[PDB]
Design a protein around this ligand. Sequence first.
Ligand SMILES: [Zn+2]
Lengths: 98, 105
Amino acid sequence: EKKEKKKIAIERIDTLFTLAERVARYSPDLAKRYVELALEIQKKAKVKIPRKWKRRYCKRCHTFLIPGVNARVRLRTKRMPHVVITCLECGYIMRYPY
Amino acid sequence: GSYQEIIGRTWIFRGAHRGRVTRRNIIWHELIGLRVRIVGSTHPAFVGIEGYVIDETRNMLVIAGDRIWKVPKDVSIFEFEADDGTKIKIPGERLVGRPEMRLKK
Ligand SMILES: [Zn+2]
């Protein structure tokens, strides 16, 4: 039953990202542990990150991103439309086509 | 030990765990974010402590209730709370291993 273990894996990733969002305001290092555990789970079980989570951590430092607290989010659309996200903890900039 | 920021803030954990956890599958699932009570332990001061599991290492669960407790797995018996409020009872021995390493068996 590979199907069960892939199911469990996703539920674990989902749990840990949900907890990182809940704790990040108060203990950013705990949130960072949750994010990194989730990624280690993801590559051990060879599953995908739920779409709602995949832009919510810094790909450089693994901080969980709270827009307005430890992250700057802008919509930039005058030329090539994109979302620009800056991790205020390491300064890494992530851009996604809009 | 960045656990102290959670004291007084455990309400943040309510509704956060997203798995359906059973007595069969708890061995493979996320223990972090589950409410737990310790029903038995070799160390007298651990019996009766309740809180959320906030971290896990190979033979230890970090629990936040009224204070932070580091409780070892192998000498303890745990009553975890699933999402419907039913209880899962299991010897900590069965949970020994790093959280990532527990995925297989
Ligand atoms: Zn960063």
